[PDB]
Amino acid sequence: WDGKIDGTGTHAMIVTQGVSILENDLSKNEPESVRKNLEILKENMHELQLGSTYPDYDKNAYDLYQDHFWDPDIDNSWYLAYSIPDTGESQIRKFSALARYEWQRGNYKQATFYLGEAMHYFGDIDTPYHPANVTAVDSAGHVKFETFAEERKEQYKINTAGCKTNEAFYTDILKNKDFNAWSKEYARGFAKTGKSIYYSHASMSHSWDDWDYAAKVTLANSQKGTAGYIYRFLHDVSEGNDPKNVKELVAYISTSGEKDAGTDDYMYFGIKTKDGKTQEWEMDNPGNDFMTGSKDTYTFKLKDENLKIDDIQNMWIRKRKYTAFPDAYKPENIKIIANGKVVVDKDINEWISGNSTYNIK
C-alpha cells in the first residue's frame, strides 16, 4: 500500500482503523491489563502510524523493497553458509519480536513504532500485488492500483471485524501459544486471498469496476487482519507471554551514523555450541550490506535442527578484508532474536577494523 513518511496514507489508515476496530469489538469478559495496554497504545497512535509507513523509507541492504513481498504458496545446503532473505511474513515476525521486547521493558513509544512497522508488512502481504509477487517492474498495475486505492482509502474503512472478542475470529488468534507459528499461517491466509484477488480482479487485465471491488476486499482484510495482530499483541504483552528448538536466528544490526561507519568488506555471523561445533554464515542481503547508518536484518539457518537456546554458548560477527581499502566498521547495536523473543541486545559503538572477530555472546 502507499504510505507517506509523516505517517499518513493507506498504511496509516489501516493501523488507525485496526485499533478503532479492536475497540468496537472488544469483549466484556476482557482482562483489565489488556484494556489498560490498549490505552497505552492509543496514547502512542502517532508512533503506530509512523511505523506503519516508515518501512517504505528505510535505507536497507534491500535495494528494492524485496522484503515487502511474499509468495504464500512457495530448503538446501546453500543456506547453512548464507543468510536467508527476509519476506513480508518474516518481517512481521521480527518487528513483532522487537515490539514485544520494547514493551516488556518500558519503551511503549518505540514498542508501538516497531509494532506499526510489523503491520506495514502485513498490510503489504494483504495487497493483491505483493503476495502474487508482481513488482512495479513485473507490471504497471502495481503502482497504478496502490495509488487508485490511495485516493480512495477513506471510502473503504471498516468499523468491525464482524465478530466480538469472545467470538470465533478473535479467539483462534489467542489459541496458539507459539506466535511465530500462528503468525505465519494467519498471515498466509490473508496473503493467499491477496494472490487470488490479483488474478481475478486486480490485475492490469481484470477491469476498473473490478479494481473498486478489489480494493474494497483487500483493504477491509488489511483492517480485520491488522486488528487481529494488534489484539494478539495486546494479550502477549500483558502476561509476559513467551514463545522450543532454535532452528533459525535473526540478527537485527543497527550500523552507526558517524561517517565511514559502514563497510564494503565481507561480514560473517557465527556461533559455537556447548559441545564445540561451529557455524558461520555470510551476512549478505541483495543490495549493499552495512551502509553507514542503515538497520539490516540477517536470518540464519542452523545445521543442528534439534538445538535449544542455552546450548548456543557463543555468538560473534567477523570481518574479512575485501581489499587493501580500509572500510573499518562501527556497529551501534545488535539484537539477536530466537523464536519471537529477543535474546541478545549488545550495544557496541566500538570500531572493528581488519579481520577482527567481535564476540557478542
Question: What binding mask, one character per residue, do residues 231-270 give for Ca ion by CB under 5 A, x or -?
Answer: ----------------------------------------
Annotated ligand binding at 310? The verdict is no
300 part of the interface to Zn ion, by CB under 5 A:
no
Which residue, 248, 165, 95, 170, is CA-closest to 103? 95
Annotated ligand binding at 206? The verdict is no
Report how far apart, in Å, the C-alpha atoms of 247 and of each of 80, 122, 181, 305 are.
Answer: 11, 23, 13, 5
Residues numbered 265 to 284 that lie near Ca ion (CB under 5 A) are: 284
1 part of the interface to Zn ion, by CB under 5 A:
yes
Annotated ligand binding at 235? The verdict is no
Annotated ligand binding at 18? The verdict is no
CA-to-CA distance for 320 and 318, rounded, in angstroms? 7
Amino acid at residue number 309: I
Nearer to Zn ion, 88 or 262 (CB): 88
CA-to-CA distance for 335 and 360, rounded, in angstroms? 9
Q: Which does 1 bind (CB under 5 to 8 A by kind): Ca ion, Zn ion, none?
A: Zn ion
Residues numbered 100 to 139 that lie near Zn ion (CB under 5 A) are: 124
CA-to-CA distance for 166 and 26, rounded, in angstroms? 8
Q: 237: which residues sit within 8 A by CB, 6+ positions away?
A: 37, 100, 103, 104
Nearer to Ca ion, 284 or 332 (CB): 284
Q: Which does 212 bind (CB under 5 to 8 A by kind): Zn ion, Ca ion, none?
A: none
Residues numbered 55 to 84 that lie near Zn ion (CB under 5 A) are: none
- The minimum distance between CB 123 and Zn ion, in angstroms, equals 6
- The minimum distance between CB 218 and Zn ion, in angstroms, equals 11
Distance of CA 320 to the CA centre of its chain: 29
Nearer to Ca ion, 61 or 125 (CB): 61
Q: Which does 282 bind (CB under 5 to 8 A by kind): Ca ion, Zn ion, none?
A: none
User: Residue 268, Cβ neighbours under 10 Å: how many?
Assistant: 18
Tell me, letter by letter, the H, E, C secondary structure of 94-123.
Answer: HHHHHHHHHHHCCCHHHHHHHHHHHHHHHH
Q: Which residues bind Ca ion (CB under 5 A)?
A: 284
Residues lying near Zn ion in the complex (CB under 5 A) are found at: 1, 124
- Which residues are annotated as part of the binding site for Ca(2+)? 260, 262-264, 284-285, 287-289, 327-328
